[PDB]
Amino acid sequence: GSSGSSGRKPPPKKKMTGTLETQFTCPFCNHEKSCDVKMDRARNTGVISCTVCLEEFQTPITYLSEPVDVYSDWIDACESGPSSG
């Protein structure tokens, strides 16, 4: 058959994702950091919203919960999980 080989493999540049910035992608319109997560403790209910399509969602949260989790939930809640309240 065929073959050559060479080797050598430099390390990839450092690039991580800084979560917990009250910002997340919107699966509805998808316009990058364009959403705000409202963590209401008194009511223990996190409400998310968009800044392009004008959307909003509500979900039960707690002190331990994070502003990054609510985002994920909103996804499954839309693709399959109609919340009532």
The CB-of-81 to Zn ion minimum distance in angstroms stands at: 17
Q: Is 35 among the annotated ligand-binding positions? A: no
3-state secondary structure of 64: coil
Token code pair at residue 66: 């994070």
The CB-of-38 to Zn ion minimum distance in angstroms stands at: 15
DSSP 38: E
Nearer to Zn ion, 11 or 82 (CB): 82
Token code pair at residue 5: 């080989």
- What values do phi and psi take at 6, rounded to 5? -155, -50
Nearer to Zn ion, 39 or 78 (CB): 78
Sites of contact with Zn ion (CB under 5 A): 26, 28-29, 50, 52-53, 55
Nearer to Zn ion, 53 or 83 (CB): 53
The CB-of-12 to Zn ion minimum distance in angstroms stands at: 31
Task: Look at the block and give the residue holding tokens 């909103």.
Answer: 74
Residues 6+ apart with CB under 8 A from 32: 25
- As annotated, the binding site includes 26, 29, 50, 53
